[PDB]
Amino acid sequence: SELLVNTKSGKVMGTRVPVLSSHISAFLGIPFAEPPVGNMRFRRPEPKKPWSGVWNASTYPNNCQQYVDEQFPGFSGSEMWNPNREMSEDCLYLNIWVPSPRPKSTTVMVWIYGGGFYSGSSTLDVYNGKYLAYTEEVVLVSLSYRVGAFGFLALHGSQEAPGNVGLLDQRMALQWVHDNIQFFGGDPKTVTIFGESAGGASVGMHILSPGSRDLFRRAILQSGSPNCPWASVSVAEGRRRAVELGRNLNCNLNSDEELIHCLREKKPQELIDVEWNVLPFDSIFRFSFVPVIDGEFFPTSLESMLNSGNFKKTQILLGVNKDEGSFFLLYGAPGFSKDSESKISREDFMSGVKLSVPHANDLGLDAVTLQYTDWMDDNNGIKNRDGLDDIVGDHNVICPLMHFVNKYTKFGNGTYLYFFNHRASNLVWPEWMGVIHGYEIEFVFGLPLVKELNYTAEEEALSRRIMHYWATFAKTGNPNEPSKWPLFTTKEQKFIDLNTEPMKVHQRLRVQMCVFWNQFLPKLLNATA
Amino acid sequence: SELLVNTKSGKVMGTRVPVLSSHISAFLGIPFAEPPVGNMRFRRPEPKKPWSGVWNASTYPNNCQQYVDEQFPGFSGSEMWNPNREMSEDCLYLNIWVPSPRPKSTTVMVWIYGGGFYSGSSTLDVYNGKYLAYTEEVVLVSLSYRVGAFGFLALHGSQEAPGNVGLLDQRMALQWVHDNIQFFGGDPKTVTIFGESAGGASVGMHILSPGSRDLFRRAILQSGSPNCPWASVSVAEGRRRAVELGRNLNCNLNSDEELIHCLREKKPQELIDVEWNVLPFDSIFRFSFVPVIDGEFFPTSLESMLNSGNFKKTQILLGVNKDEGSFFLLYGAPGFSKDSESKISREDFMSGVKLSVPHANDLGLDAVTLQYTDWMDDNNGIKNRDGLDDIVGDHNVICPLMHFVNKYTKFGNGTYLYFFNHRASNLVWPEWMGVIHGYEIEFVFGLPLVKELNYTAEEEALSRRIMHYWATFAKTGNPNEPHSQESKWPLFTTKEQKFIDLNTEPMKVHQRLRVQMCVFWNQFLPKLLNAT
Numbered sequence A: 001s002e003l004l005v006n007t008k009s010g011k012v013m014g015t016r017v018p019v020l021s022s023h024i025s026a027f028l029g030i031p032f033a034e035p036p037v038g039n040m041r042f043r044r045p046e047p048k049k050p051w052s053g054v055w056n057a058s059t060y061p062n063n064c065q066q067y068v069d070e071q072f073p074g075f076s077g078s079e080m081w082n083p084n085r086e087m088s089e090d091c092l093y094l095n096i097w098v099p100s101p102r103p104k105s106t107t108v109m110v111w112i113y114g115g116g117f118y119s120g121s122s123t124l125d126v127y128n129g130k131y132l133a134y135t136e137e138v139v140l141v142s143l144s145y146r147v148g149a150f151g152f153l154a155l156h157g158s159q160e161a162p163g164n165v166g167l168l169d170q171r172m173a174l175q176w177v178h179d180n181i182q183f184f185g186g187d188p189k190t191v192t193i194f195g196e197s198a199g200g201a202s203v204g205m206h207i208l209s210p211g212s213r214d215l216f217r218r219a220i221l222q223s224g225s226p227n228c229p230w231a232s233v234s235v236a237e238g239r240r241r242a243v244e245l246g247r248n249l250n251c252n253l254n255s256d257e258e259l260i261h262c263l264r265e266k267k268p269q270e271l272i273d274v275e276w277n278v279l280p281f282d283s284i285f286r287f288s289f290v291p292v293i294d295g296e297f298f299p300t301s302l303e304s305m306l307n308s309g310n311f312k313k314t315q316i317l318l319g320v321n322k323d324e325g326s327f328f329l330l331y332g333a334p335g336f337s338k339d340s341e342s343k344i345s346r347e348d349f350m351s352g353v354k355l356s357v358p359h360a361n362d363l364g365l366d367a368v369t370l371q372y373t374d375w376m377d378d379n380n381g382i383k384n385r386d387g388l389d390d391i392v393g394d395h396n397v398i399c400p401l402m403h404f405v406n407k408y409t410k411f412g413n414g415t416y417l418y419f420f421n422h423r424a425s426n427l428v429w430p431e432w433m434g435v436i437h438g439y440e441i442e443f444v445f446g447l448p449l450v451k452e453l454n455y456t457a458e459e460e461a462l463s464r465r466i467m468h469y470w471a472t473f474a475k476t477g478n479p480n481e482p483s484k485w486p487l488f489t490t491k492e493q494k495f496i497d498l499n500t501e502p503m504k505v506h507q508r509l510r511v512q513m514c515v516f517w518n519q520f521l522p523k524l525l526n527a528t529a
Numbered sequence B: 001s002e003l004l005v006n007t008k009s010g011k012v013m014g015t016r017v018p019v020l021s022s023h024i025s026a027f028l029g030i031p032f033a034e035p036p037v038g039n040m041r042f043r044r045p046e047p048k049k050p051w052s053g054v055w056n057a058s059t060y061p062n063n064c065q066q067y068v069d070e071q072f073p074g075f076s077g078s079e080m081w082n083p084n085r086e087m088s089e090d091c092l093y094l095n096i097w098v099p100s101p102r103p104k105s106t107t108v109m110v111w112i113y114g115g116g117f118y119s120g121s122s123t124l125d126v127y128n129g130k131y132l133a134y135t136e137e138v139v140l141v142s143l144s145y146r147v148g149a150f151g152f153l154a155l156h157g158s159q160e161a162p163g164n165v166g167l168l169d170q171r172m173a174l175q176w177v178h179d180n181i182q183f184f185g186g187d188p189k190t191v192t193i194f195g196e197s198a199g200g201a202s203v204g205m206h207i208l209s210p211g212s213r214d215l216f217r218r219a220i221l222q223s224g225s226p227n228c229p230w231a232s233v234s235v236a237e238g239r240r241r242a243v244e245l246g247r248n249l250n251c252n253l254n255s256d257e258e259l260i261h262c263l264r265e266k267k268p269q270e271l272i273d274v275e276w277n278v279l280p281f282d283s284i285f286r287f288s289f290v291p292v293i294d295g296e297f298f299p300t301s302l303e304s305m306l307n308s309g310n311f312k313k314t315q316i317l318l319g320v321n322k323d324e325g326s327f328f329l330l331y332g333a334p335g336f337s338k339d340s341e342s343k344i345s346r347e348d349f350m351s352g353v354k355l356s357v358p359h360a361n362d363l364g365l366d367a368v369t370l371q372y373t374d375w376m377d378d379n380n381g382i383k384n385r386d387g388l389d390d391i392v393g394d395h396n397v398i399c400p401l402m403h404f405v406n407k408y409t410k411f412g413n414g415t416y417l418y419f420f421n422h423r424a425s426n427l428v429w430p431e432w433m434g435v436i437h438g439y440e441i442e443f444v445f446g447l448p449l450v451k452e453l454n455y456t457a458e459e460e461a462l463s464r465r466i467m468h469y470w471a472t473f474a475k476t477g478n479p480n481e482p483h484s485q486e487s488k489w490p491l492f493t494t495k496e497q498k499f500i501d502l503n504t505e506p507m508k509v510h511q512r513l514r515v516q517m518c519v520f521w522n523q524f525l526p527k528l529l530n531a532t
């Protein structure tokens, strides 16, 4: 049968599903690992033992145990990112959408959800892969991985909680694709991994890791890069946060073994309840348990790997959204609200930059402040608001990504950069938030093609060209089918705008601010902090 | 006789001179101190001992011994600033222009020339005071003071070379005015001191120094203020440069006494030929012998006095020119030429910032560079030229002055700020230089009123309103003539921070003169360099 597939670990039965007055095959909740429960908590994933009989793959799997956002109850803007299935530690599964009829060795795209490494689910409505797999004729896979302490508690030296297991979960799903995608009509040789934010940073990390390099052909990074300030920690910081987590739960701290044993006895929700208490500063856009630079998954520091060219050489397509920081200001900075224009006073501004650049000393805060304040109108609440918004986005997403793109292009085989700046006409968030972090996703997945979602015809057109750019790039390493999307080069540094208007080519995306964040501030902090 | 005046030191005989179809009385080269020669070189000035007979005051006196610029031989643009009279150490004289018929108790304005404290002369053509004295009916006085090592060699502790003697020369000229100006029809109670650049810094220093405060009513500072990075040095730096001077002349450096004695036996030109070698680093807009914070002429640090309000509280009128730094880039930075557009390559821009900010460490240099570079277009030679121009002007003149104006206004009794940005039609310098340092002076002195000079009619009008603002301010403490139809120059207040543009176009009021850059220069950079 078309829905009955035999994989190297057993048989699986999919389901024919509707998609734009038609149908395609979908295999939901396929296990690619053994359930990480009990003694398995905090440990590297183990290949899923082969089962007999037919695995029912007609419904979405559980979502991993995670912090759940309750800020705005009932609000669709925030609720659309929360788990839409039961949460469980038994969550390592993948989903696959296959064109119907089943293609012959077609391009494979593997989605990696974001969520700051503390959240995310593969089953969200916006991650439904039926529109993209169908419209672009590609086999679309969405994997999952452990988040929060469950996937990143790091006690370097130990083998019970080595850290980065969430990345290893991802790597194993990729290994599973490499080994089984051919039975679904996919070409294990032409696999493209792509993800947004933590997903984008994850993609970048696999590009840098020797152990992941041969598990994919090309990469797409959306609003995230491996070198982001919030994307990783040192082994030492990882350890203190782990110890602090144990302290918060009255754990025995005499040894890694005792701490770990103690933590394995706690119910998932107990860990999660205190997760945020281990952060070293009052801050925004900073998450507790993230990847650690251990010398194993990552040979050396991320920077040295970028400089020496020690990473996978291939084609990459990446970009950022216009207003990456608004979401985090709304949730953690004083003066911001979802129901007002959020004019920011001078005082709140100062509090805001402190929260945005937690690691900075006073001279560093003055530099940031000076770089983003218009002293001919320092009491303009709109400028103060937009100024803060730029600080968070530049420092956390845009500039770290530009640093990555420039380093990568020295050795890469092709870079395509984009700047997504279209504010969806049906957004439920306030205007001041602008082009929000993560909202380019619905366009990549083709949600504007379903009429009941009330998108405009130009938005549906944009989505189609984005999907086509993404899929064409995945198939050939070039988003253009022989308005050309310029190749980003060390010399020209061209990039395109991604919106409803005709394609425009620009150069040096926010170069002034990125010189500040990538070269000046770091130098100032190393010489005075 | 209108030309025969008897002063507290003896009789003086002036001369009648032509001025715009009329006539005015002038007393040139009136001595106000004893000749600072021989054993008196480096010493505080001493009152001119009384003379008998009539002192012929019909010609300009000698100019003090100073470095002479020979960069462009024959070029009027630079030569107009060089000594136009023989140089001598015997140079403490003043000049006076008195309206005819002689006023009864009229306003007095005392000019203090600039020249980085290493040059200047009260006898230049641009300082001819007959036009302003005649046009605004004021008694105009131009004084002089020792410059270079002669006026600022400083060996703290010593009484032979105390330092700041050039500032003391100025004070003595002021004391002379206070005691004798009434004999020329001037009011000792209503004297206004004004000077440009080093002269501007001097004016602000007399406002700061307790011993100078009672010698004048108010002040005008043009393109210069006391807190400028080049206007003063610490006792230590002063001593180091004095010793380094002797070293350059193979002097006995065992004691200030011998060092001084050695230096006193050298010919003037000998000291001048080595003057520049004592500077700490390669730089632009830095001069060897300038005032020193001695705890005497200046009770404490300039910054502390400004914060405490420890200074003369009165009315001040001050301002700057749009392109203060071009002159100095031309003379000492690579890539600049008076015969080309002077487009600067990124390489020379970098060299330029180091020269311009000599005391800054690498981190400081990077902050300056980032602050004045448009990274979307870093090879645009024009943007680099203008960026460097702005750096020099902002660091050395504009921002130090804004710092001063804001501090002073917290305690002052009225502040008026201007931004001079008119490029003279007959300027011999290249256009890239814009509104050059010191070229607002010719407007202040009414040169545009003399037709053979070929200024435009609009420039004559600008000069007349500038002279009127200046004189009306000196007379009343307000540049504006009460209830008049003409636009009004608003008071600069700590809150609104208003100022006006001074050019041939109708007045425009603005706020926060270059706040962005001055926040960087006055607050951020100092903290960055102080860090470590």
Ligand SMILES: *[C@@H]1O[C@H](CO)[C@@H](O)[C@H](O)[C@H]1NC(C)=O
Binding pocket: A056, A057, A058, A059
């Ligand atoms: C798979 O499980 C779902 C229940 O979640 C059920 O409705 C469906 O019939 C099952 N498929 C088969 C044939 O077992």
Ligand SMILES: *[C@@H]1O[C@H](CO)[C@@H](O)[C@H](O)[C@H]1NC(C)=O
Binding pocket: A412, A413, A414, A415
């Ligand atoms: C990619 O590699 C091929 C093969 O060496 C080379 O010819 C091509 O120029 C490269 N493309 C880029 C943009 O680096």
Ligand SMILES: *[C@@H]1O[C@H](CO)[C@@H](O)[C@H](O)[C@H]1NC(C)=O
Binding pocket: B056, B057, B058, B059
């Ligand atoms: C004063 O000096 C001038 C300049 O030489 C001369 O013309 C004039 O006759 C002199 N007056 C007397 C009384 O000597």
Ligand SMILES: *[C@@H]1O[C@H](CO)[C@@H](O)[C@H](O)[C@H]1NC(C)=O
Binding pocket: B412, B413, B414
């Ligand atoms: C100057 O001082 C007088 C009284 O001494 C005061 O009335 C006046 O308001 C002051 N002027 C300004 C502008 O500060």
Ligand SMILES: [Cl-]
Binding pocket: A018, A019, A020, A021, A450
């Ligand atoms: Cl549908």
Ligand SMILES: [Cl-]
Binding pocket: B018, B019, B020, B021, B450
């Ligand atoms: Cl004349």
